[PDB]
């Protein structure tokens, strides 16, 4: 019994004999079984006998012989003149849809905090606000063309007044709850909630539609997404990331790994994509905590990041504010609404089509100390209504896997080449300064760069993939991977071929509806195709 044999042994004595097992159909299952056979049979026993008395004579050959010749798989060759550019859709230009704006943001620094100062974000935001003079009377310079703009003006004024009115309190609060006002109620959509009843009473009503089953609009490609990507690959004057330590190294392979990761970290430490990563992590964590803590209040949440300066001083930065609605989240799909306010120095009237979901105000003037003398430039504010998720919060809280992925890609490229030339090629990648890689385009032709540039480019690509997730990206990636493999096979002198080339294309275009990142990727693929076979 210690092994698992006592039960079968005990259930095997039928009086004075021994029976191994018993199992019968005997009933409804018999009738169900008799109806699960090929059409020329009636009983299971006859089918079993026919299967038992089977010998293969000539069946497959005869069936193949009596089959039509229209069923075939003919190969058509893939030549240098075969491929054609992918077709992109046409229509009105596309617009911005990120959670926080990237290229057009400025900061209000508290500069150095005391090294022992660890405090509440509200007072850090207030101290950052105090160091600025130059507010004016706000007014609208670009309307939302959908909604009421005076509500936006009143919301900004109320935020400023409620931030100033802290001093009328006996005790200092830890968090700020906004008053439930008409304009804030309109902005957060607290009075457009449909009411739910049973179908029986509303059977005879009229003007009832199924749902928002409408064909998506088609939009073309603009020139601002390329500008954003260009700016995202540059270097800054801060650090934005400091990693911990590990033990000392002994084995040679540890030395090689340490040198690889040290070069990579030194090259990608000061990039702007790291700032985007930190911004996303902080904002999402704060907003999730506020949603879980306060459930029936209009809470004010600041936008804050931290970094280390060139000289070695800690700094704190402020980007704007977020006002949260009501958060009663039972599952991971429920949506919480909010409104966002951000500072900027970019004039909205140069590219009005980029900002289609925004209302822009003018709030003050800024003094610039650059070069000789002092000059003043206007300051603006961007306001918008949005509501994200509970899952996408967790998605935003994990953005260091982009760093992990970039390091893995670089290491894989090194390791692939280390196997053909059977030596160690990590020194020939980084230390050598005469190596150049094609990573750009210009009216003159194809340009070149250094290893740090390709590292930062890969990191930026990973970050932008994280920030613009959609199924179109998946479909395009798969189909483009297939086409790229076929083109490489052609370039390697291996005489490739295809069975149906029109269908692959048709899939590529049908996965190209509306998103700007996907359209930029398609344009990049077309530009690659025009050079790889010419």
């Amino acid at each position: 019994a210690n092994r698992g044999l006592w039960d079968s042994f005990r259930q095997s004595e039928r009086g004075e004999e021994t029976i191994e097992e018993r199992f019968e159909i005997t009933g409804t299952m018999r009738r169900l079984a008799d109806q699960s056979l090929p059409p020329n049979f009636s009983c299971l026993e006859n089918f079993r006998a026919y299967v038992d008395g089977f010998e293969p004579n000539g069946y497959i050959e005869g069936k193949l012989s009596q089959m039509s010749k229209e069923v075939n798989a003919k190969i058509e060759p893939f030549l240098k003149t075969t491929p054609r550019p992918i077709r992109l859709p046409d229509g009105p230009p596309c617009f911005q849809r990120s959670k926080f704006l990237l290229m057009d943001a400025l900061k209000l620094s508290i500069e150095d905090p005391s090294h022992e100062g660890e405090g509440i974000p509200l007072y850090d935001a207030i101290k950052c606000m105090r160091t600025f003079f130059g507010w004016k009377e706000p007014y609208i310079v670009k309307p939302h063309e959908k909604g009421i703009n005076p509500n936006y003006l009143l919301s900004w004024k109320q935020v400023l007044a409620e931030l100033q009115d802290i001093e009328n309190e006996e005790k200092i609060p830890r968090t700020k709850n906004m008053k439930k006002t008409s304009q804030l109620k309109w902005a957060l959509g607290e009075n457009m909630a449909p009411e739910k009843v049973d179908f029986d009473n509303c059977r005879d009503v009229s003007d009832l539609k199924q749902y928002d089953s409408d064909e998506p609009e088609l939009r073309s490609l603009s020139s601002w997404i390329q500008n954003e990507f260009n700016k995202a690959c540059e270097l800054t004057d801060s650090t934005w990331i400091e990693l911990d330590e590990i033990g000392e190294d002994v084995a040679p392979i540890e030395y090689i790994a340490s040198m690889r990761r040290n070069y990579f970290t030194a090259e990608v430490s000061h990039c702007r994509a790291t700032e985007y990563i930190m911004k996303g992590v902080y904002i999402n964590t704060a907003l999730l905590n506020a949603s879980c803590a306060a459930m029936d209040d209009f809470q004010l949440i600041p936008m804050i990041s931290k970094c280390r300066t060139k000289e070695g001083r800690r700094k704190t930065n402020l980007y704007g504010f977020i006002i949260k609605g009501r958060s009663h989240l039972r599952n991971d799909t429920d949506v919480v609404n909010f409104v966002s306010m951000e500072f900027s120095l970019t004039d909205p009237r140069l590219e009005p089509h980029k900002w289609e979901k925004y209302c822009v105000l003018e709030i003050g003037d800024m003094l610039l100390r650059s070069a000789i003398g002092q000059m003043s430039r206007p300051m603006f504010l961007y306001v918008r209504t949005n509501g994200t998720s509970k899952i996408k919060m967790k998605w935003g809280m994990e953005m260091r896997r982009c760093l992990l992925q970039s390091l893995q890609q670089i290491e894989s490229m090194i390791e692939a080449e280390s196997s053909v030339k059977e030596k160690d090629m990590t020194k020939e990648f980084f230390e050598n300064k005469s190596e150049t890689w094609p990573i750009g385009e210009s009216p003159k032709g194809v340009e070149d760069g250094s290893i740090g540039k390709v590292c930062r480019t890969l990191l930026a690509k990973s970050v932008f993939n994280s920030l613009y997730a959609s199924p179109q990206l998946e479909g395009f990636s798969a189909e483009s991977r297939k086409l790229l493999l076929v083109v490489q096979a052609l370039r390697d002198n291996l005489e490739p071929g295809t069975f149906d080339l029109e269908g692959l294309y048709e899939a590529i275009e049908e996965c190209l509806i509306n998103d700007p990142w996907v359209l930029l990727n398609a344009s990049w693929f077309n530009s690659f195709l025009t050079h790889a076979l010419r």
Binding site: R31, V51, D244, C402, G440, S442, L484, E495
Partner: protein, 686 residues
């Protein structure tokens, strides 16, 4: 300069930087499954692919069924589910001929698995559809509810603790004229046909509870067969797959008397699930089990019979709205068979119009096809036979082929003296596959000379077989305590290095990120740091009073000594020989009030935790009460012949008498314990 990373491929080959194409590092935050919209499309399409079959009406359920077997041969290149019994049987016979003794050893190895399995096996897996509540529940709850309902109606045969008895009782249940369901006190009645329908429905697909036990044995037998074939790459994973890809290319490139050509193909199959048919599975099972005892045949043949006549649940329904009164409502699918079609749009209208004949009690009938997943290792076996048919002795011509084939992805290599032979071989393979019920996707396949191909995200260049089929680790905190998280993290990193292809440089940065997260979560920073938390004063005092600062754990102020070479060693054993005597005595003191290769320590604490059955935790109480009498039950399974109450009472009496004799406790409570035991014995007499 305008920067785009795609032009990096003009200098680096595609296979060297193919990892730049995959965009994600995890599961994206959106869903594409959809509800009732896609199920109707699936049903309509799988019925479209086999229109020319034979229509019949069920005599035990009352549902239409379609039989496409032995239908007309196809005339175009569109997918067609018209298979022939003769071809399948001949392919199986030739597979048996090529590898003599492959079908008997599997049956003998599977019989002992069948005859010894226990009932606990059904509690492992994902969520399972529950017929007693018309929802989804974890496996344990579903099994418990099914047992409760079964015992309520006189079907008590699973008390033997054997899976086969549970299956016998399920078959007996399926042959009754009345069923009763009591909910905690409603008491609903279900007739024969309604219960039969509810015992054949599939979710939108996890199975039911009356069908998993039969699927398990079939999967076991299929795995046993697949383990003995070299053309199957499914059960293996890792370096074994790399060896499998290397061996076929080595075999086909012997280049003896080199006057012959070689070509390879990367291919996919279109509409895999909705072109299979359970009848061919039944035929395969029947052929496999020749010259075997009859009960084994019945047990292995039960499941395809149930699949051959199954019901598909639609979903939750539709949501409507009004643009004037600010109103919204939900339409269940149970009343979808009779509502007027003026409300819906064009697509939904035609969908509903086409789906109406196949609708019974909110579920549609779907005989011809496999829903989703399931029977993977049997479809692989069916696929491997066509590859086996490519030997010289069976083609009887100049060309011949071989390859390896997974559940849905395949690679094939063809050899011929000229181009015409290669074309003829490809055509014959295509036609033979279409003869059995497998369709090849033309728009997702290409052909080139041998030297480069792909198989399930395993990219093969001239000698390098880099793979990208798995994702990166989590490098986060598990959430048990401050002694179990370190071991889990380092073990995960080590296992990913060993099994997958995680590089050495990436492991170090993963360790760095894990340490950062650990320190932030548990508020344990180094003693010589300016970060202020609630735990800083104690850490600084301990740091100041300590002589050897390299022997303190990371949990309390110490630095980390981990690197690649010592990821397999526990932390305490690693730092043992560098810490002070008093620190050792305090830390490893087995009388603490507080208490994957970890030592006990004072850091292993526990945090604060926050119908059918009247109480759902009734077995657990009886279980936990047992170890208080027999502490060894937590280490190994007990063995005995008596009941639980006998052992408990006997041990209690013995312990009470020994305690009284030793004088540890006075005489007052001895009589009380004796009378309580006598009362328990009296209540047991009923």
């Amino acid at each position: 300069m305008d920067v785009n990373p795609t032009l990096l491929f003009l200098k680096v080959p595609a296979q060297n930087a193919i990892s730049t194409t995959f965009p994600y590092t995890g599961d994206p935050p959106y869903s594409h499954g959809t509800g009732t919209g896609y199920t109707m499309d699936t049903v309509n399409r799988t019925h479209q692919y086999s229109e020319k079959g034979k229509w019949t009406t069920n005599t035990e359920t009352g549902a239409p069924q379609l039989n496409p077997i032995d239908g007309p041969l196809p005339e175009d290149n569109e997918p067609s589910g018209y298979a022939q019994t003769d071809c399948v049987l001949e392919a199986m016979a030739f597979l048996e001929e090529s590898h003599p003794g492959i079908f008997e050893n599997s049956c003998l190895e599977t019989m002992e698995v069948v005859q010894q399995t226990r009932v606990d096996r059904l509690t492992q897996g994902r969520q399972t559809y529950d017929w007693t509540l018309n929802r989804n529940q974890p496996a344990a709850t579903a099994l418990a509810n099914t047992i409760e309902v079964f015992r309520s109606n006189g079907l008590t045969a699973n008390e033997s603790g054997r899976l086969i008895d549970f299956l016998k009782d399920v078959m007996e249940s399926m042959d009754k004229e009345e069923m009763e369901i009591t909910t905690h006190k409603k008491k609903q009645r279900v007739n024969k046909r309604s219960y039969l329908i509810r015992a054949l429905t599939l979710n939108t697909a996890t199975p039911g509870m009356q069908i998993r036990g039969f699927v398990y044995f079939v999967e076991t037998l299929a795995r046993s067969i697949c383990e003995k074939l070299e053309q199957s790459g499914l059960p293996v994973g890792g370096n074994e797959k790399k060896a499998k890809l290397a061996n076929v290319v080595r075999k086909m490139m012997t280049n003896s008397q080199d006057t012959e050509l070689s070509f390879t193909i990367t291919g996919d199959n279109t509409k895999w699930n909705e072109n299979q048919n359970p009848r061919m599975f039944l035929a395969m099972i029947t052929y496999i089990t020749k010259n075997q005892p009859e009960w084994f045949r019945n047990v292995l043949s039960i499941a395809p019979i149930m699949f051959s006549n199954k019901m598909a649940r639609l979903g939750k329904g539709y949501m409507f709205e009004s643009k004037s009164m600010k109103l919204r409502t939900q339409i269940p699918a149970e009343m979808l068979a009779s509502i007027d079609l003026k409300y819906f749009n064009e697509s939904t209208r035609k969908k509903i119009e086409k789906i109406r004949p196949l609708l019974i009690d909110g579920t549609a009938s779907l005989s011809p096809g496999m829903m989703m997943g399931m029977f993977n290792m049997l479809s692989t076996v069916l696929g491997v036979s066509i590859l086996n048919l490519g030997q010289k002795r069976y083609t009887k011509t100049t060309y011949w082929w071989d390859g390896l084939q997974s559940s849905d992805d395949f690679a094939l290599i063809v050899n011929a003296p000229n181009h015409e032979g290669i074309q003829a071989g490809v055509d014959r393979f295509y036609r033979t596959c279409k003869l059995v019920g497998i369709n090849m996707s033309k728009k997702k396949s290409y052909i080139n000379r041998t030297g480069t191909f792909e198989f399930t995200s395993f990219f093969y260049r001239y000698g390098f077989v880099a793979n990208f089929s798995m994702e990166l680790p989590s490098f986060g905190v598990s959430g048990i305590n401050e002694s179990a998280d370190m071991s889990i993290g380092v073990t995960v990193i080590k296992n990913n290095m060993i099994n997958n292809d995680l590089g050495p440089a990436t492991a170090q940065m993963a360790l760095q990120l894990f340490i950062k997260d650990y320190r932030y979560t548990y508020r344990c920073h180094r003693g010589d740091t300016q970060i202020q938390t609630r735990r800083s004063f104690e850490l600084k005092k301990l740091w100041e009073q300590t002589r050897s600062k390299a022997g303190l754990l990371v949990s309390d102020g110490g630095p980390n000594l981990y690197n690649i070479r010592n990821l397999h060693i526990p932390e305490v054993c690693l730092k043992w020989e560098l810490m002070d005597e008093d620190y050792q005595g305090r830390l490893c003191n087995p009388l603490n009030p507080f208490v994957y290769d970890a030592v006990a320590t004072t850091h292993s604490w526990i945090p604060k935790r926050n119908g059918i059955l009247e109480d759902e935790q009734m077995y657990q109480k009886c279980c936990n009460l047992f170890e208080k009498f027999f502490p060894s039950s937590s280490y190994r399974r007990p063995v005995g012949i008596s009941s639980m109450v006998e052992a408990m009472v006997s041990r209690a009496r013995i312990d009470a008498r020994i305690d009284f004799e030793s004088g540890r406790i006075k005489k007052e409570e001895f009589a009380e314990i004796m009378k309580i035991c006598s009362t328990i014995e009296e209540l047991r007499r009923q």
